[PDB]
């Protein structure tokens, strides 16, 4: 026959279309869309039985264990994360390269990427992955700082196809000044990079943590109290101001604050190139879960402060940054996904064990009496596992339960926009004959009376296919799940089973994003020298 | 051969993708998309030479001559309008059926549509067309009326596939009170119709026109002065408030006011189902063009205007429409609205009256009728511009090529796909879907070519419009691309400047319920409609 694979009787969903058609796949790529394709032309035929077919999900906010250990030891390798991703319908992930301050000169940032690529080249990869670069040390003063930095960004792009840079406005060791952000923006704009910011006011966070500890208020729940949404709002406002002065396109990661969403919306209405990301957890969970409706029935989650009130430390399962917000906030995150505030949705996947206490990758790492650590929220490793649950959670709580407008909005923010904003388009993100990698998800049919033994009813840890010992969504009902995950024209997940023999993932060299060319709009008569 | 038509070497543009691929067409529909299709498989092969291929344009705001003469006599029939559409890359138009106050009972609104369908069934149609229903007489009081109106909308949908209703907040004879709008919203929400509003405060317009005439300020330019942007803003705010109270999806037609755009955006941010339309003229023209004397058209390059003919005091009427073309500095707002999601769709508000003949009932000079106490005052000027032909090329050029729109995808979204979705013609129309889409396609000229194309026009002229009007307001301006092929239901109807009449086979279109116009189910108080 002439094609490797034909998908029949399915409904194709893209960022802008929903329709019944059939797909042929060959040599790792989408080859054809047509009404009906002769089954004898394919080596393998999949009957979708009326189910939706979506592009594979693209999660551009994933944390994996890396050699510099910026977030300490993390339980998931690239092997584990990509396995988990695929079991949950995600077929591309983008992780983070930590700037290595021991490397100097023109190649310093390319050498930072090399550490990661070399490490992951020996692991079994279930899908493709890319890398963002994290920057936390910027040279001073600016006029030099901006010029050698320029050469370094070119080298990172030319050698490894990295075109995105991530910076922090909070966290000791990561927080950089406004002045240094401007220096970076100068370089990124010039090179057409995608500039990413974690926008919380680090000074306010630090002061409030100290004030809480002084009163002995150190339980997990006070992580939220130390940094209310007005702190994320202020910083996001300040960061927009910087981007405006510098005419530099900007993406805010994991937005959770209504105040932040407000200033982001206002900038987008003005036509400034301000992009935003949010995460399932900010729409589905509230901070009531950290101690003892448009989201998850919180009492249905198992192994939480509600079910285990004797365990005072169990709130740590849900500690992340920015914090899961108070009741009443979650609805404005859904509205943000529908109204255009959020360009993409990522997971902020970051995994630390709860049911083992001794390892360096345990949440209980917060207990270290010999290093003046006694379980205070300050010392809790921040993050939740989420790479597997991202796609099904939006399918269910978003599309089926009506919190997202349609399947097309789902695809737009989960698949196509991530590819576009991070320079993986059109190789990834869509279903384009002759062009797209054959990265596809076939779901189960929604309106069927037929029983599918392989379709899960609840989220469990075993279902995650990851290396962590818990998921925060443990025990909750889930109303659909990937029935097939196809990665580069091969079936890698089938009806609850991973097919390791079809794992052929590779590092992905990315291009410059067409969304991140500058507006050419300025506040004053000043222009950068190179203009 | 197995297929009627193959398009090779082109670049496919949809509402969310841009990519090089080839298309096969048979029996009026898109059959196949693939990297490369064997040319021996097609009866006809078109080499696109690297140019973009878009879906055909869908203009859901077109006015044609109709038997009840709501807008007086209009120069274009459905024959003329669809010919003009096709010459400009538009492959579906939606015009308007005037409520016939002489028909009574359950079938009264279906009977209104029948008048139009019957009349156009004898004309040569170059592409498909649908109809919106215009409502200006609502029965009172609301409760007792509910059954009849509800039953009437059902009959209009069941018999003629009409699923949209249009109402006016201005114009004597058309303006309806807030009370009556709520009665209509009650019925339309219940039937999943698309509710359309022209939102200008009619009372403010009426008062200010009388104030201006009292001072003798009657020239065409004072049309704009009689109804500044704050008037469109107020009424748009009022209409949103009504739609909110009634949990009814709403579309605002030809939005031109920054204040209107602002309250529209705020509602969209809240998640209310508020949609909006704008038109090329609100982004490209300013009111300076209505009397003698960088993001729009260079106004001095327009031929046959108050700039070139300052002797002709009435020539400003060529550019009189409602809402008015706005003062300098407003036009940029409209582009931003197209980019940031404020505007769901772009239509033309195509409405044609002759300028170079003065005697007929379809002339602009209709405003001169000494016996009916009419002496050229702006009040008597028939409102409207021809635009159905120029809509797609104007956005291609001044939008995509000149960088006022963000991408070709955004162009397709607002010009083709969203119009189909919001008015229940999707997926039959609006996209390029194998086995599903009517083969309605445009092949442009290649942008980056050094090759000469004798058939590619450099300027907009009246002759190029292929319409029945004797002017276009964009006469004389540079245009940097144009449809090279317009394919309608798998047949070539426009090729390189020539209309192919023998391939004209357009039909009336029965439309469905729009998936965008199901209600949000969100209310201001504990009250719910009886049927829920
Ligand atoms: N307003 C205008 O330009 N023409 C009359 C058509 C209409 O808007 O109903
Ligand atoms: Zn972060
Ligand atoms: Zn993170
Ligand atoms: Zn109107
Ligand atoms: Zn109109």
UniProtKB/Swiss-Prot annotation, chain A:
Cofactor entry: Zn(2+)
Entry-linked InterPro entries: Amidohydro-rel, Hydantoinase/dihydroPyrase, Metal-dep_hydrolase_composite, Metal_Hydrolase, Metallo-dep_Hydrolases_sf
Cofactor note as given: Binds 2 Zn(2+) ions per subunit.
Amino acids binding Zn(2+) 2: 166, 198, 254
Reactions performed catalytically: 5,6-dihydrouracil + H2O = 3-(carbamoylamino)propanoate + H(+)
Modified residues (N6-carboxylysine): 166
This enzyme's EC code(s): 3.5.2.2
Positions with a binding annotation for substrate: 171, 321, 382
Binding annotation for Zn(2+) 1: 61, 63, 166, 348
One MF term in the entry's GO annotations: dihydropyrimidinase activity
Expression induction or repression: Up-regulated by dihydrouracil and N-carbamyl-beta-alanine. Detectable only in cells grown on dihydrouracil and N-carbamyl-beta-alanine as sole nitrogen source.
Keywords, comma-separated and alphabetical: Hydrolase, Metal-binding, Zinc
Processing and modification events after translation: Carboxylation allows a single lysine to coordinate two zinc ions.
Top-tier EC class: hydrolase
GO cellular component terms attached to this protein's record: cytoplasm
The keyword Hydrolase is assigned to this record: yes
Assembly information from the UniProt record: Homotetramer.
Stated role: Catalyzes the second step of the reductive pyrimidine degradation, the reversible hydrolytic ring opening of dihydropyrimidines. Can catalyze the ring opening of 5,6-dihydrouracil to N-carbamyl-alanine and of 5,6-dihydrothymine to N-carbamyl-amino isobutyrate.
Family: Belongs to the metallo-dependent hydrolases superfamily. Hydantoinase/dihydropyrimidinase family.
Name of the molecule in the record: Dihydropyrimidinase
